[PDB]
Amino acid sequence: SEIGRTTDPVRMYMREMGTVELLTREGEIDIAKRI
């Protein structure tokens, strides 16, 4: 775990941002359908 290792808020943001995977053409459609 990389927790407690850096000070950069850019690295912290990219780190927590990359834990969500991209959607397919079909993933956007049923998320929009859920909305």
Catalog residues that contact another protein under the rule CB under 8 A.
2, 5-8, 11-12, 14-15, 18
- Where do we find the tokens 């053409």? 25
Q: Which is nearer to another protein, 5 or 34 (CB)?
A: 5
Q: Which is nearer to another protein, 11 or 30 (CB)?
A: 11
The enclosing H or E element of 33 equals: helix 25-34
**Residues 12, 5: Cα–Cα separation, whole Å:** 10
Smallest distance, another protein to C-beta of residue 17, A: 11
Smallest distance, another protein to C-beta of residue 2, A: 5
Tokens of 12: 């912290």
